[PDB]
């Protein structure tokens, strides 16, 4: 088992940031997925890991990450047999600065309405990363994502 995390980022307007993994990524390259995900460092909290990776991959600052699916665990296998088994708590947060893309990690991105992303995930789950789908289909997690679509002034 390995430790990891996943995060869903929204802007002040309530739009969700979806990203596409770079072609050079070892696992799931070129796949559309939720905002960010990674792995915490030896003595680092999950919250700080989210903050660190948001800065590293998206060059963005965020509000305090909220835990929306702490017990999420998953074992998925990428297109060339690479297998991943991890404890992956899920978080949601709002961006507080403009994005500055790191193309070694992200090859494309889109600010969208959550309602549309959920419709896409429900209709064609194969077009997205498996963890994005599994996380978005959890009733409790989905309710928290919905809460982040509120306009924040």
Domains along the chain with CATH numbers: 1-153 (3.90.79.10)
**Residue length, the chain?**
153
Catalytic, out of 61, 86, 88, 112? 86
Report d(CA 46, CA 64) in Å as an integer. Answer: 12
Report d(CA 56, CA 79) in Å as an integer. Answer: 26
Which approach determined this entry? X-ray
Evaluate whether 6 touches 91 at the Cβ level (below 8 Å): yes
For residue 10, give the nearest of 69, 48, 62, 72 by alpha carbon: 62
Q: What is the DSSP string of 35-101?
A: SEEE---TT--HHHHHHHHHHHHH---BSPPEEEETT-EEEEE-TTS-EEEEE--EEEEEB-S----
44 counts as catalytic: no
Please report the resolution in angstroms: 1.5
Q: Is 86 annotated as a binding residue?
A: yes
Report d(CA 43, CA 46) in Å as an integer. Answer: 10
37 counts as catalytic: yes
Q: Is 144 annotated as a binding residue?
A: no
Q: Is 73 annotated as a binding residue?
A: no
Q: Is 37 annotated as a binding residue?
A: yes
């Amino acid at each position: 088992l390995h430790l990891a995390f996943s995060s869903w980022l929204f802007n002040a307007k309530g739009q969700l940031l979806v990203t596409r993994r770079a072609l050079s990524k070892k696992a799931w390259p070129g796949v559309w997925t939720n905002s960010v995900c990674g792995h915490p460092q030896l003595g680092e909290s999950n919250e700080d890991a989210v903050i660190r990776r948001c800065r590293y991959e998206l060059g963005v600052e965020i509000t305090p990450p909220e835990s929306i699916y702490p017990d999420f665990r998953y074992r998925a296998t990428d297109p060339s047999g690479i297998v991943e088994n991890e404890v992956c708590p899920v978080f949601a947060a709002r961006t507080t600065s403009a994005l500055q893309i790191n193309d070694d990690e992200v090859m494309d991105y889109q600010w969208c309405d959550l309602a549309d992303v959920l419709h896409g995930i429900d209709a064609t789950p194969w077009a997205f990363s498996p963890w994005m789908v599994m996380q978005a289909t959890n009733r409790e997690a989905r309710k928290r994502l919905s809460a982040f679509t509120q306009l924040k002034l």
